[PDB]
Amino acid sequence: GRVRTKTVKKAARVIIEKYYTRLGNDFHTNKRVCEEIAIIPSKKLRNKIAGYVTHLMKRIQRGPVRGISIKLQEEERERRDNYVPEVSALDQEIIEVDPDTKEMLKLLDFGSLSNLQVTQPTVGMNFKTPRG
Amino acid sequence: PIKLARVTKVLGRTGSQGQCTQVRVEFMDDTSRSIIRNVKGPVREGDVLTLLESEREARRL
Amino acid sequence: DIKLFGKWSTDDVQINDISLQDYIAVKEKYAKYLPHSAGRYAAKRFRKAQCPIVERLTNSMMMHGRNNGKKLMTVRIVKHAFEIIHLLTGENPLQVLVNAIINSGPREDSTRIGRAGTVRRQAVDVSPLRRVNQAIWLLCTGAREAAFRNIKTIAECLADELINAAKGSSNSYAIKKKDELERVAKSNR
Amino acid sequence: VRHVLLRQGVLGIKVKIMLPWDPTGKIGPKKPLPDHVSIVEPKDEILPTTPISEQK
RNA sequence: AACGAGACUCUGGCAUGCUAACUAGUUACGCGACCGGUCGGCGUAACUUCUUAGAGGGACAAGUGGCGUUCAGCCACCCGAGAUUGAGCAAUAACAGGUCUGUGAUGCCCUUAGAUGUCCGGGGCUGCACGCGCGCUACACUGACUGGCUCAGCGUGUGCCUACCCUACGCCGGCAGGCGCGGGUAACCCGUUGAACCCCAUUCGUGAUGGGGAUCGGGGAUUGCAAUUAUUCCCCAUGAACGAGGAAUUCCCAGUAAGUGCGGGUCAUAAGCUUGCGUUGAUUAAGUCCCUGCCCUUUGUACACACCGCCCG
């Protein structure tokens, strides 16, 4: 079959990671830039690097890939990670406590908290999985 | 009697030396009978098999 | 427009069985002027279904060792047979070829299972492509075996079995093997 | 491959040397191995911020 | 991380694009010849399609669609000359494998002057009641014969000692050959390599026949110093087995098997061998672990100069 060995895949991964701006989807202009960037002993390896690159550039539009790391995604993930909402998800006016949680807060002298709305506790003591 | 058939999907290639393909066989009388049969020879999907005893069952030889 | 050997046309040839329709060639666009085509039919599986069955019969005509390369020998054997067929019947000689290939191939074989010397077979189906493959084999070895030490030539011995297989007679070598290949097949079932 | 004649008999000596690269200013072969792909280290593209029309 | 795998190197296939061709040509122009045709017949020019051989291109699973934890990849199809061409090279670790008969590689030993050196002469290496292997020719009609017709590719060729050749053409011979007479140290000559099956006509007519040619009796001619235990070759004649082969077993997936010739090595003489090359050219398969084996993972071992084991009467 047609499996690409570690030489083609290692070279293709570094040449994506360093020169992502020049590479696109055409295998032919990928081959014309993979022979100007790199010094490959010639064509039958040059067309195999440029073909895995042409299969690897289509794999970058659909999301990240678990090897290489390129700085058009890794700025978008950075701006996705520095994302705070306007009002936090911990600012709830009605938070729900059990009966016994309120007793722990009264031990911690937090029975004067106004936002707590004690729920009705569960009527059945049914939590274990039915063994057998 | 003799019954004429068709091929829905080839399942797998059985036999002592792998000479028999095992095939999921539809009939041609608009029948919902999807019998499984033992065919000897080259088969692809969408053939027209011809059986003599149309009530036999697929074993593995 | 396209007549085999420039004389026999293909428009009135009518395959009977639905089991062999997609596999037996010429009716429509496999019409050739000659059986010699020199094409790469063995390059993939099932590709030889799309070759004209006149070339199939020509190719299996040259089987034995002293005739193994001779294609221009066997195409004139088939051409001279297609005169004797037309004389002895009076119709188009391609309808009798598909009548012989429809009739001669078995429809239930036996697959061999046992030990070293022990034979306990079992009956299976027959794929229609193996039916076409084993039709032409029985026809051609019947023509080969009954012309060996005989004054009859190969063109007469091919034609006098290529009609006897169309008529379903049991004097032809082909139908004599098919009914026994099904007789020993039913004997296990 | 060379021979030695000792007291007791003959020895053979086989010596293999894998030579290195560095195109021949006196040493080694010119071309690299057929699987050694080298990649030119990119000088980074400087970031184009505002359209400057440099009429020179 | 390192080696082996792959990459790599040679080869096949494509290019009316580039580089150039009197030791390769095609087309055109006159001339000539015989009926606008035919010229592998003669000389000029346009040029490289055909021929040569150099650089550079070209194919990447690249495109489309299915299946894949939508990953590695697999399958089918378009466009394509092409969607696995064929080889070479090839690890670690081993073997009581072969080679002292390839060496002026070589340790020990044997022999060294009626020599185990070496030369000469003559035999033998071939001997035949019979076993065992590689093969060639066949058993015929899909054929044998006798005519006619029309196509290759890889190659080799005048040699340090060294004698030893590829041979066109004219004559004489049924023929094997014999005389001269030229060319060629070769893309210049054999050579347009005027191959064989194949193709087209006549004869033969299912019989040990005109299939098959063994084994033999006479001649003739080359090679050699020498042809008797036949060196080969030519002509008559003789005309056996063999009627498609038991148990058993070999090789093979496409320009393949098989047929069919041709070159090279050996070669004074000489291929039923081998090594390459063409030409004609298929059936069946695109699968399995049944057999024979190789391998990986679990696992039983009272085995480990290791099941050809160890061991009990």
Side-chain angles (χ1 to χ4, degrees), chain A residues 1-53 55-132, chain B, chain C, chain D:
Chain A
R2 302 207 187 186
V3 189
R4 273 71 64 101
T5 69
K6 274 166 194 174
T7 303
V8 174
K9 291 188 175 167
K10 257 190 185 176
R13 274 167 193 146
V14 185
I15 195 173
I16 290 281
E17 191 205 9
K18 298 193 172 169
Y19 285 88
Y20 172 70
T21 45
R22 321 211 207 186
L23 305 164
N25 268 346
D26 202 21
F27 157 76
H28 293 88
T29 48
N30 275 9
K31 144 188 64 178
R32 295 297 157 186
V33 65
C34 286
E35 69 168 359
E36 203 199 330
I37 293 161
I39 304 303
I40 318 165
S42 202
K43 300 153 62 184
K44 292 194 209 165
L45 187 42
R46 202 264 327 274
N47 299 353
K48 289 198 178 184
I49 277 159
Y52 193 53
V53 167
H55 185 70
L56 211 58
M57 279 291 308
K58 303 195 305 155
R59 217 182 143 194
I60 293 167
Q61 327 291 281
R62 283 178 288 114
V65 284
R66 204 223 58 83
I68 46 183
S69 170
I70 187 54
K71 317 302 295 181
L72 205 171
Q73 306 192 335
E74 294 300 324
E75 279 273 312
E76 180 45 57
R77 199 271 311 274
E78 183 55 51
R79 287 173 267 98
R80 198 188 313 273
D81 272 351
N82 309 348
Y83 165 58
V84 282
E86 280 273 354
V87 169
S88 156
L90 310 157
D91 277 353
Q92 322 156 17
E93 311 311 294
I94 297 311
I95 61 179
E96 298 285 332
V97 308
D98 305 321
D100 298 272
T101 303
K102 178 73 179 186
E103 310 304 311
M104 180 202 64
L105 302 170
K106 182 180 128 188
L107 257 75
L108 271 64
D109 57 65
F110 298 128
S112 43
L113 267 176
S114 316
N115 314 343
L116 324 173
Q117 202 277 331
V118 52
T119 177
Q120 193 71 242
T122 47
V123 53
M125 269 199 281
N126 296 318
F127 54 92
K128 280 180 193 166
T129 55
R131 71 187 85 93
Chain B
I2 49 184
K3 289 298 296 302
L4 181 62
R6 188 178 165 82
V7 165
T8 45
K9 179 190 163 306
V10 45
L11 306 187
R13 186 180 284 264
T14 76
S16 202
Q17 290 97 18
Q19 74 268 345
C20 291
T21 319
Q22 220 177 34
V23 59
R24 187 193 228 147
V25 180
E26 201 90 2
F27 277 72
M28 309 219 88
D29 304 66
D30 211 330
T31 317
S32 43
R33 275 215 313 277
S34 281
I35 194 71
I36 319 290
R37 290 306 291 254
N38 294 156
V39 59
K40 158 185 194 184
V43 177
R44 47 190 173 164
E45 158 171 340
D47 218 348
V48 184
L49 259 63
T50 296
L51 323 100
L52 300 193
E53 187 156 344
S54 90
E55 314 266 20
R56 297 175 52 201
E57 201 53 44
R59 41 185 280 204
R60 288 94 186 165
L61 301 175
Chain C
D1 270 321
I2 304 305
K3 270 79 74 174
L4 183 76
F5 310 110
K7 184 168 71 173
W8 308 126
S9 186
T10 58
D11 57 352
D12 73 91
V13 195
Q14 205 71 28
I15 313 175
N16 191 0
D17 273 28
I18 311 305
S19 297
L20 308 184
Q21 202 146 15
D22 44 49
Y23 290 159
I24 292 181
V26 51
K27 171 63 176 54
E28 212 177 310
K29 83 190 66 59
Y30 310 131
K32 303 302 174 45
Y33 279 154
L34 272 165
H36 197 287
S37 73
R40 305 182 260 185
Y41 298 123
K44 200 172 292 299
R45 200 191 188 214
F46 294 130
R47 182 77 198 190
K48 45 162 174 178
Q50 304 181 348
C51 86
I53 208 156
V54 197
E55 187 171 0
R56 292 277 278 240
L57 187 87
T58 287
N59 284 347
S60 177
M61 200 72 54
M62 52 184 182
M63 203 186 75
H64 264 65
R66 38 155 175 150
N67 307 305
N68 258 326
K70 308 187 186 159
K71 186 125 179 199
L72 300 188
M73 187 70 73
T74 45
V75 62
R76 58 95 175 166
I77 290 165
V78 171
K79 170 176 180 177
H80 294 352
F82 278 5
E83 299 289 326
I84 308 172
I85 290 273
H86 172 85
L87 283 196
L88 280 180
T89 304
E91 59 195 359
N92 187 275
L94 286 185
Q95 184 46 56
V96 58
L97 184 53
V98 306
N99 280 335
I101 294 159
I102 276 166
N103 211 310
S104 316
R107 297 172 294 181
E108 175 203 344
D109 269 302
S110 319
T111 42
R112 178 98 72 107
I113 287 92
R115 303 315 171 232
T118 86
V119 180
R120 197 264 313 139
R121 291 176 85 124
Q122 199 269 344
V124 297
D125 307 2
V126 167
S127 170
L129 187 49
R130 199 211 156 86
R131 189 187 301 172
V132 178
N133 291 352
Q134 217 188 1
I136 310 180
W137 198 76
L138 291 170
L139 293 179
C140 282
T141 72
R144 184 174 296 129
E145 272 198 291
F148 188 69
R149 203 164 320 137
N150 189 9
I151 310 172
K152 183 177 291 293
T153 78
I154 187 74
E156 319 167 33
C157 188
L158 178 72
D160 302 307
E161 209 195 359
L162 201 66
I163 47 175
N164 280 21
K167 304 188 306 167
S169 81
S170 290
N171 43 49
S172 87
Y173 177 86
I175 318 292
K176 280 274 269 190
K177 293 290 109 181
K178 153 160 179 161
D179 83 287
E180 179 67 345
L181 213 47
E182 293 172 355
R183 172 60 196 162
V184 84
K186 181 185 284 185
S187 316
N188 309 110
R189 193 49 72 100
Chain D
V1 178
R2 279 315 176 278
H3 292 155
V4 197
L5 180 64
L6 299 182
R7 165 186 58 91
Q8 63 268 45
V10 185
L11 307 193
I13 297 180
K14 302 171 160 184
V15 174
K16 296 186 192 163
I17 314 296
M18 183 161 179
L19 302 169
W21 200 45
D22 217 337
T24 320
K26 84 191 280 293
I27 176 171
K30 292 273 192 57
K31 47 197 171 323
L33 277 165
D35 45 309
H36 179 274
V37 186
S38 51
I39 292 176
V40 159
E41 179 71 33
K43 167 43 57 175
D44 60 89
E45 208 170 52
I46 198 55
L47 317 178
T49 309
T50 170
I52 297 193
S53 316
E54 196 167 345
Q55 289 207 335
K56 298 301 291 300

